[PDB]
Amino acid sequence: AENLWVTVYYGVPVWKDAETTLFCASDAKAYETEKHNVWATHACVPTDPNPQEIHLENVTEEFNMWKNNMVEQMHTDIISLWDQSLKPCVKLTPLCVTLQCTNVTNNITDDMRGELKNCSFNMTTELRDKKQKVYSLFYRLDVVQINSNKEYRLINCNTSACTQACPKVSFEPIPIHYCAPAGFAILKCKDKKFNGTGPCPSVSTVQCTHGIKPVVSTQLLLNGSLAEEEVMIRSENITNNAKNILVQFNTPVQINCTRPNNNTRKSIRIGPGQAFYATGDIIGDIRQAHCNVSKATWNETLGKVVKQLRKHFGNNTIIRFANSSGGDLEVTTHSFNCGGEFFYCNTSGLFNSTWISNNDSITLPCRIKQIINMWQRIGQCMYAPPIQGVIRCVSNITGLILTRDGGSTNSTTETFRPGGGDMRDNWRSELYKYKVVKIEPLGVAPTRCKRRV
């Protein structure tokens, strides 16, 4: 009776916390169009479907979004994949050359400036002895003045030769389902009210995560995952200011964005099999690209998020907003890709408010760069191919990324500002529900049986 022996049980449900690599798995609709249509047509497997998302009881694991892994390796994976869709494409060594630019044919004022420059320049042919003369159009943010005449050059041609993206491939988002291999498990906090930190009371295991699309956006993350019922804010430590504040609200705000200009692409042969898609002529009215949001829904959602912000900050507090304080281009404004072309669209018009302790729309003008320098790499650029026609796209604004000014000296106003910074804070808004655990079977337990001879 009290002569207890021991038995080792194999396969015991128990785990620890660990860090492993994962494995992407995308749906077959990206495999309908084939042969390097977009990325993850050869990098991810087609999905084993319908994951075994079952429930679990009487259980509590502490979570963390901040020192969580699988967000680090995703920020490695997306960059590492992003490089692999460029090496089959053209390099622009023969194009960093003296330009002869002039203004586009347009009624120009003396003060306000056109954003298009009609530039002619020498170029090689397919042959080597002969050479050709050709012209294209460029925005104000890709030429600088080298120093009568007024000759320019491209901006990145003193640091890195540029890679044209192939116009065959596209940059549209696609769902990625991460999966854990055999010998691991992925938990999911199914609780409603959970600020991403501290113990979740109702976890549930899963085989593979649900749809996680990748977007690129600094302020005002787009097409995101909606909050469940309320409006939630999340942070690491709110009285610290050096960490951002993730706001995930409930109802999406529809945003329309467009370029009303009608373009033309113009193929220029550089050498054997080298095709440079420049911008041709502009048919119609030279007009400025812009975006619209709805007035009343935005004024409503700010009234929601102020009601949610006042919990952590005292009830009687004046709360205001401001434009971003400065820096480089794509952290003051907000950036996004809309059908294969990048915008940089001013957001002074959304954050001009103050909030007391008691048919129209908002237009906001954009700019269009053609070369990008995403993730701020030392040897990288990407000339975007100019796309045809009048362009527009419709999206859902889902959350914000904010930053408190942490000033000293007796503040009653707590002014807030948008800010992009790292790209990883976009990602942490999507993987806050999960963690990854490692199964360790072969437990051990005292009981009452004796093994015979």
Binding site: T239, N240, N241, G406, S408, T409, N410, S411
Partner: protein, 102 residues
């Protein structure tokens, strides 16, 4: 906002006499650090976040505390161990203490 107050403030002890400073926060839930500024020289963090001392720091400085109440115990001091001490919450700075050689 958050107010910091060192204690006792200006102190006066001979070399060899071990001591302890204590700086009080206005409200809690946070964890302070400390600094050691010599006569007209570069300031120097000697202990971070509660009890973790930095690189190039001997273990004779031991800091501790909880609540709104944080202690810094200095033991086996030298005439060169003494200088002016500060304590920091996130960006806020106390006015400092000084332990005069008697």
């Amino acid at each position: 906002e958050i107010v910091l107050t060192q204690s006792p403030g200006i102190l006066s002890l001979s070399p060899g006499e071990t001591a302890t400073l204590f700086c009080k926060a206005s409200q809690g839930g946070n964890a302070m650090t400390w600094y050691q500024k010599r006569r007209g020289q570069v300031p120097r963090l000697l202990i971070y976040d509660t009890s973790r001392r930095a690189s190039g720091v001997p273990d004779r400085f031991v800091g501790s505390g909880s609540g709104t109440d944080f202690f810094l115990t200095i033991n086996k001091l030298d005439r060169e161990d003494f200088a002016v001490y500060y304590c920091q919450q996130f960006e806020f700075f106390g006015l400092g203490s000084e332990l005069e050689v008697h």
